[PDB]
Design a protein around this nucleic acid. Structure first.
Ligand SMILES: [Zn+2]
Ligand SMILES: [Zn+2]
Lengths: 81, 96, 237, 89, 84
RNA sequence: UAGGGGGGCCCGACUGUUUAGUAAAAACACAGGUCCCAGCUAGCCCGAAAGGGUUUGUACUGGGGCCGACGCCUGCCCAGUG
RNA sequence: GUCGGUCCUAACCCGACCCGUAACUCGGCGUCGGGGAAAGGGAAACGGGUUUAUAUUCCCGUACCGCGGUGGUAGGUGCGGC
């Protein structure tokens, strides 16, 4: 639904345009925290929400997590990046 | 849309008019209803429908034009998209 | 004697030939042997001025990739999708066979025999009206007023040609007419035959008058057909 | 002046010399800036020059790194979004 | 502006006659007013070339008449094929 | 360096063109008016034919004549020649 | 090697095949191929000196282009910014 923590999205701006990404936290109304999580070459970086297209997929995590703690969720959840 | 219901929202509750703000509220959350005009840009229309069908916000398509919405409200300009945040004393959500 | 302008035109010299290297290519539909029963879809990507045509043309890109020119209808928008074929809707800009076009519809760019690419009702502001359908012929009213029968498998496009009202405004100056004629290498300025010498014209001579009826028989030889050729009547009404 | 230089495709310029001559130099004209395929708007991050000037530049100094460098960024984002939304089912 | 009777045909001055000056002036006055767009509804449509009309705001480009965006026969064809 | 001016009449509406070497004009052209042929393998035309011009065109088009901006107007006669 | 011609196409022209002509060094022709711009498109050099007479062409100084090599590196297997 929303830009919920745990949402899978594609970047549509910049170098890393065409790549999935899982949302980890929320900073301001406009900015959120996105991790590539070491499936793909994207680090832990603040991005604008205009530059992401959200996918219906989702993941079970908490508001603010780690990279070794997300990779797990995608183990069984059934989500390749 | 209904002149009387939307004017009652205008004076009792709170509205946020404009396509950028509407798209942002449909993407992050914080709106109750979104109203889009027939002839609005297909880009904006598609974005709104997608983000709101995901978030779970109802979208009403106003059959008239953007100019007509703007004039319905007390405004000399286009209002292609509109977001109802705070309803009040009106039955506007009852129309979607 | 000496020759007439109408006899010098037949030789095919630069003074008389059309400058068609200046124009955009010819306008034809799509061949049947490649649109047999497929109902092709295309998108309009440009509308252009054509110097040899009197009507604006549009550039359509089809799905495979093929680009083509069409004669543009009044109302067509850049970014609009058109359909060519038998199962195409009845909408301004679409091309269908006459057997699938209701009575009362306005139509342009009609073929003479099926597959010939388009012959009839092509100019700015013209339209034809479908009058009657049968199993052997479709009767259409052409802009000259005349009723004509076509084969029901001939193709036509729905709507009116764009560029009408062209003659609502005076040319005003000789120079504007100079440029308008130069654009298509028309003979301009035009001389009068009664102020030519007798060696030059069947009219002609120092007293500047036609001295015989200006109505001339359909069977007269070339060099002699000037004035009113095989006229049924003459005059005001 | 030679006829080849009486031709107004050569952009003449006057230049004073270390010997006090004040001579005329001739050069060819620069081509205009790259434009978008969809909208015809100008592009950013793309340099102007003749072929010999462009061949004295490396690859990454000729275009921006982001994908679809032949499009303006708005149209690029349109394209990426449409790809995404068609990659759902 | 500061002419009683002549309009755009004040560029002519004395020449070419009443009928022709009047007609040119009328056609050009009706052509040079901003027209309603069929996509956005605003009055921002101007002529580019003979038969080609463009909106300044939305960028919409469409085919029409020589000196006006619409023709009578065009309106009739629209009405009829909207019926069918 | 650096216009002589004003009032009547005839022709042609105007800018434009013309008899290289005795005529620059009241002669030609012009916008515009009106008549004729023609639905395309057409109508008009070149050529011994093959082929071709108008034609990368289709009646708001192409070809053929007469009058000649604009304003007020354009009467009667089809026996004769066509 | 750096200036112009030797490349590209324009309007246009030619040949072969094909058709016509009693025939041709004549007339055509869609296509295939070939030509067609010393002011259109189009890689790269400037200053100073030297001769009776040449010079962006010789000499001095300082440069650039194309092709071909040698040897290292960026990369293949890397990053900064919403
Ligand atoms: Zn663009
Ligand atoms: Zn518009």
């Amino acid at each position: 639904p929303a830009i919920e923590v745990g949402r899978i999205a594609v970047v549509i701006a910049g170098r890393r345009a065409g790549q999935k990404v899982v949302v980890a936290d929320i900073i301001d109304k406009n900015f959120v925290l996105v991790t590539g999580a070491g499936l793909n070459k994207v680090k832990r970086r603040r991005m604008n929400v205009k530059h992401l297209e959200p996918l219906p997929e989702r993941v079970n995590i908490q508001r603010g997590a780690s990279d070794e703690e997300i990779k797990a969720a995608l183990e069984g959840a059934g989500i390749s990046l | 849309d209904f002149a009387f219901e939307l004017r009652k929202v205008q004076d009792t509750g709170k509205i946020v008019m404009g396509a950028k703000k509407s798209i942002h509220l449909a993407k992050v959350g914080g709106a109750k209803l979104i109203i889009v005009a027939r002839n609005a840009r297909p880009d904006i229309k598609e974005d709104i429908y997608y983000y709101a069908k995901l978030s779970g916000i109802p979208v009403y398509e106003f059959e008239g034009t953007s100019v007509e919405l703007g004039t319905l409200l007390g405004r000399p300009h286009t209002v292609s998209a509109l977001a109802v945040i705070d309803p009040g004393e009106s039955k506007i959500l009852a129309l979607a | 004697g000496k020759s007439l302008i109408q006899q010098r035109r037949g030789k095919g010299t630069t003074t008389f030939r059309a400058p068609s290297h200046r124009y955009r290519g010819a306008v034809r539909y799509v061949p049947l042997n490649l649109v047999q029963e497929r109902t092709l879809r295309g998108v309009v990507e440009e509308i252009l001025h054509d110097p040899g045509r009197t009507a604006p043309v549009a550039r359509v890109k089809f799905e495979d990739g093929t680009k083509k020119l069409i004669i543009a209808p009044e109302g067509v928008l850049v970014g609009q999708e058109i359909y060519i074929g038998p199962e195409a809707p009845i909408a301004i800009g679409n091309t269908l066979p006459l057997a699938k076009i209701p009575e009362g519809t306005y139509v342009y760019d009609i073929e003479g025999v099926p597959g010939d690419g388009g012959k009839y009702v092509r100019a700015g502001g013209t339209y034809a009206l479908v009058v009657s359908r049968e199993k052997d012929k479709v009767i259409v009213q052409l802009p000259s007023g005349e009723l004509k029968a076509f084969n029901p498998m001939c193709r036509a496009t729905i709507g009116v040609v764009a560029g009408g009202g062209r003659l609502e405004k005076p040319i005003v100056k000789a120079g504007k007419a100079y440029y308008i004629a130069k654009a298509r290498n028309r003979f301009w300025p035009k001389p009068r035959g009664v102020k030519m010498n007798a060696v030059n014209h069947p009219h002609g001579g120092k007293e500047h008058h036609i001295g015989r009826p200006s109505t001339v028989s359909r069977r007269a030889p070339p060099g002699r057909k000037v004035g009113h050729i095989a006229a049924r009547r003459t005059g005001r009404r | 002046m030679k006829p080849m230089y009486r031709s107004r495709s050569w952009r003449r310029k006057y230049v004073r010399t270390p010997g006090g001559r004040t001579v005329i130099h001739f050069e060819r004209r620069k081509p205009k800036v790259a434009h978008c395929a969809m909208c015809g708007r100008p592009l950013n991050g793309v340099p102007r020059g003749r072929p010999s000037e462009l061949r004295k530049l490396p690859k990454t100094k000729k275009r921006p790194e982001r994908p679809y460098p032949n499009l303006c960024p708005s149209c690029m984002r349109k394209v990426m979004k449409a790809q995404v939304r068609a990659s759902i089912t | 502006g500061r002419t009683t009777k002549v309009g755009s045909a004040g560029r002519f001055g004395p020449r070419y006659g009443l009928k022709i000056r009047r007609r040119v002036a009328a056609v050009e006055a009706r052509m040079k007013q901003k027209h309603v767009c069929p996509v956005c509804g605003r009055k921002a449509v101007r002529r580019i070339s003979t038969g080609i009309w463009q909106c300044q705001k939305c960028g919409a480009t469409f085919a029409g008449g020589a000196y006006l965006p619409t023709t009578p026969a065009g309106k009739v064809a629209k009405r009829v094929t909207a019926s069918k």
